[PDB]
């Protein structure tokens, strides 16, 4: 599951910098309070370690 989560995180990270931005988090949901809550509970930015902490 970890490899799949890493692949999904890399897919989200279009800029290739390794840090997903809140604008990208908002964008990937269009395909309000919940996104801000998950940003707060996962954190001024989100990295891979926070991603796997939230996934687990």
């Amino acid at each position: 599951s970890e490899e799949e989560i890493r692949e999904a995180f890399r897919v989200f990270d279009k800029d290739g910098n390794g840090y997903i931005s809140a604008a990208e988090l908002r964008h990937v949901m269009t395909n309000d309070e919940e996104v801000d809550e998950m940003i707060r509970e996962a954190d001024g930015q989100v990295n891979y370690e926070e991603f796997v902490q939230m996934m687990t």
Binding site: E4, E7, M38, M54
Partner: protein, 343 residues
């Protein structure tokens, strides 16, 4: 020299044109005479003698045209191989072919009333039936063999044509236009065979089953597609032979289609590149949404885990695993696409 050889090509091209005009004229007068000889008048009428004299007049003219045409072919052989004597070109094979064309083209309804006793057992009833049929019906059917002049005209008038044998000409015609060849021949055989079945079976059919032209076209069509006979079983052996002949052509024309619709479904180099591009766009979007569902379900699992509920997180975990599987499937489909594109 070269100018003389081109002149022989022109005369050979012109003679085959007139031999086709008289070839179809003999058939057309035969068809009109056969149709009218049934109900319009009788075989001994002066109209029957007159129309059967136009066929004889056209056959004598045609046979002279075939002899002259082959005489030009002899001269072309003399020029090409630099020979003078006739016998140097009169090989055994050529004599047989010249005689074959004369025999095929000299079969036509001879003027004068001649009859023979025709006996055949009815289909689906096995009841014998005897009628005094005219002899011109067994001579009218072979007249359709004059259609070989159409192939000769086609070859001698094709722009691309002018080894260049009939094998290469037919093979290249199945590539430039495989549908027109398989449609003109199919329709032409449809009318020719349907009329032949009706003409041979208008004597021994008194219930208007196969003697009807529209009913004969159905019989030829089902036999050609090898569907079956139904109740359209011919009574005579001329109608049975034509149905068998259409059946054989119906198993070779449904074998060329399988070998033509297989080449026409493959994608060309240009079409493959376009197809790869549109699939890549679709899979790029699919990978975005599949992974987006993965994150959404993965966090939704966490949100209900802290909610102290049991049934809540269970549903989200089941959806997360399904999203993971679909995410993996689209990745494999995408990766296979890149492999094909690179190669």
């Amino acid at each position: 020299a070269l100018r003389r050889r081109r002149a022989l090509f022109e005369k050979r091209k012109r003679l085959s044109d007139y031999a086709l005009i008289f070839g179809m004229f003999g058939i057309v007068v035969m068809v009109i005479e056969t149709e009218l000889s049934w109900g319009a008048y009788d075989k001994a009428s002066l109209y029957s003698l007159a129309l059967k004299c136009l066929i004889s007049l056209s056959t004598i003219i045609l046979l002279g045209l075939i002899i002259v045409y082959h005489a030009r072919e002899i001269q072309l052989f003399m020029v090409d191989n630099g020979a003078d004597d006739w016998r140097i070109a009169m090989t055994y094979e050529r004599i047989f072919f010249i005689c074959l064309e004369i025999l095929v083209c000299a079969i036509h309804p001879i003027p004068g009333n001649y009859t023979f006793t025709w006996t055949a057992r009815l289909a689906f009833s096995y009841a014998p039936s005897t009628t005094t049929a005219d002899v011109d019906i067994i001579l009218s059917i072979p007249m359709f063999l004059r259609l070989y002049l159409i192939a000769r005209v086609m070859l001698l008038h094709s722009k691309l044509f002018t080894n260049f044998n009939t094998r290469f000409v037919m093979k290249t015609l199945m590539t430039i236009c495989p549908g027109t060849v398989l449609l003109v021949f199919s329709i032409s055989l449809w009318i020719i065979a349907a009329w032949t079945v009706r003409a041979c079976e208008r004597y021994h059919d008194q219930q208007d089953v196969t003697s009807n032209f529209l009913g004969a076209m159905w019989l030829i069509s089902i036999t050609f597609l090898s569907i079956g006979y139904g109740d359209m079983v011919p009574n005579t052996y001329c109608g049975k032979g034509v149905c068998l002949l259409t059946g054989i052509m119906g198993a070779g024309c449904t074998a060329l289609v399988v070998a033509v619709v297989a080449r026409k479904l493959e994608l060309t180099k240009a079409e493959k590149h376009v197809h790869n591009f549109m699939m890549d766009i679709q899979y790029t979007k699919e990978m975005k949404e599949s992974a987006a569902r993965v994150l959404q379900e993965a966090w939704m699992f966490y949100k209900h885990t802290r909610r102290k509920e049991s049934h809540a997180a269970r549903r989200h975990q089941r959806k997360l695993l399904a999203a993971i599987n679909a995410f993996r499937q689209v990745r494999l489909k995408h990766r296979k696409l890149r492999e094909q594109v690179n190669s």
